[PDB]
Symmetry: D2
Amino acid sequence: AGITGTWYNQLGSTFIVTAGADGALTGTYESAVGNAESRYVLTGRYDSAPATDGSGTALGWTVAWKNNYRNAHSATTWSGQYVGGAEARINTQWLLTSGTTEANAWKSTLVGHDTFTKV
Amino acid sequence: AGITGTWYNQLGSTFIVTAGADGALTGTYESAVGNAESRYVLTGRYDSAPATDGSGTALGWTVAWKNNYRNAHSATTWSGQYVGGAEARINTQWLLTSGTTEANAWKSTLVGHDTFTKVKP
Amino acid sequence: GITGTWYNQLGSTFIVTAGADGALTGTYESNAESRYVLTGRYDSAPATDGSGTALGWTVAWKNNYRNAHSATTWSGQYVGGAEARINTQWLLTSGTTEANAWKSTLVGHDTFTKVK
Amino acid sequence: GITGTWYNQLGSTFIVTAGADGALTGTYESAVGNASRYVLTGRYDSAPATDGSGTALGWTVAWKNNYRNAHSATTWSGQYVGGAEARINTQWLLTSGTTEANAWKSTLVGHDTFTKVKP
């Protein structure tokens, strides 16, 4: 599958993921420094039988920004595709929703994009 | 009362979820739309210690659209918050990315919004 | 069917003229201090098979009184009939430094109706 | 500033004029999709902050001209960042006209970055 291992985004974040035989993604999302206070559980899913026509492999995962040290009362989901090869990539778009009151719900969700590489 | 239970979105999809003590979301999703049949595995995360100021509970989950029956070569993530009340609700926005070639990647991702209630609309 | 006054789910008012050349022009009120210019485009020759009419518009949140240094775009479709609607999703980008650009853009949805 | 000819990462051409009143006007030529030139209109912050922040802006293209009509429209929302290599960084939504039953799949999302040099 080529997904299991450590990936790095464009802004100094790191995630270590295991892609299970059944389609499970499990691992940890952290900062470049990697101190315990920056590490969070991740969990998601991927297509364990992708097409063989040159298409990427669809996948997604979630991090809720609570660990044993802090809690931002928020969660990010990344949705994207893995592309293999010597320059392997995971290309994603993300949604970051914070817990808000109803009056503030209109501004609860940020959107962006992350590109992950193995180096 | 809480996240654990059976939920339905505005189109009649069925979201059966368990919120574990450790922050884990597990369960199954059955889609009323798209290249989908029967139940699919979901996993996700939620804030197990939300704020006490009246804010909702942040969460998210993923379905890869492969099961024993079909494989759409795609995955949806829902990102949102649970809001408790007399009519409990989970308000989400979602991204649905298909596996594509590089030339087609620009059109790989749909976006929308789903609202879930424990009462079927 | 697009020209006129529209109201979203949260008390904003959208006053628009749909011109023959595909232009959308008008004002968005989120009174004078709360009124902002809007411009956009719409499909002036939509299908007649039950499909909606695609459209989009932008408001930059500056007027003669205030400036939030931000802009919202709404992308969606007009649906005519007895309960006509404009169903949209939106992106709100603020001007930021590069270090804060990752959190520059909010996303959401607005539904507009011809009655409050 | 914003006025000029820009190119996205896929080779589309964005010819824009930023007027004194906050107006954006011009033409867009897409290197992608069911698309020659199309009219665009939008708005920008004509008095940005003076603290190093970018200039917020957005614009719309309806994909109808004298030669094709895709029954769809794209909005780009983003900010202009000046400097040695000026750049406009955007996220976009592309909505097609659909029936109600197909409305759930009416909107595509992505991100475009524009420079004054072709990719």
